Amino acid sequence: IDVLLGADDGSLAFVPSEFSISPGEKIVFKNNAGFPHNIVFDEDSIPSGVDASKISMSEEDLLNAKGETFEVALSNKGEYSFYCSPHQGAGMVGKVTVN
Ligand SMILES: [Cu+]
């Protein structure tokens, strides 16, 4: 599943921001507009026992250039909240459900 980092109108959003997948299916987060961006899973809002570091950028890391990507596949079932660290307060957040 491709997820744009920044909408095509420049909005600071993941597109889509709420979605479901299956265990092992690629999420490709792609820099689109308003970058730099990153993708950080909230370590307090992911499934029990999941290591956020295996699936997240650090907050200090950035995708700098248009078209740069961060790929992740999620294993464990449940809800995972994530955000772009520099744009979290602007509303650049999302939630993926592995089911
Ligand atoms: Cu961002």
UniProtKB/Swiss-Prot annotation:
Entry membrane topology: Peripheral membrane protein
Keywords: Chloroplast, Copper, Electron transport, Membrane, Metal-binding, Plastid, Thylakoid, Transit peptide, Transport
Required cofactor names: Cu(2+)
Note describing how the cofactor binds: The crystal structure with reduced Cu(1+) has also been determined.
UniProt keyword annotation of Transferase present: no
Family: Belongs to the plastocyanin family.
Function: Participates in electron transfer between P700 and the cytochrome b6-f complex in photosystem I.
UniProt protein name: Plastocyanin A, chloroplastic
Organism ancestry: Eukaryota, Viridiplantae, Streptophyta, Embryophyta, Tracheophyta
Residues of the whole record sequence present: 70 to 168 of 168
